[PDB]
Ligand binder design. Structure first.
Ligand SMILES: [Zn+2]
Length: 33
């Protein structure tokens, strides 16, 4: 989650898919900030 491809949730700190739109655990949008 430091490369512009695979991202990491800001809530659970778990990396979803290498291009997911949102978290499946927290339902956090990719980058809602
Ligand atoms: Zn999450």
């Amino acid at each position: 989650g430091s490369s512009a491809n695979d991202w990491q949730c800001k809530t659970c700190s778990n990396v979803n898919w290498a291009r997911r739109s949102e978290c499946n655990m927290c339902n956090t949008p990719k980058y809602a900030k």
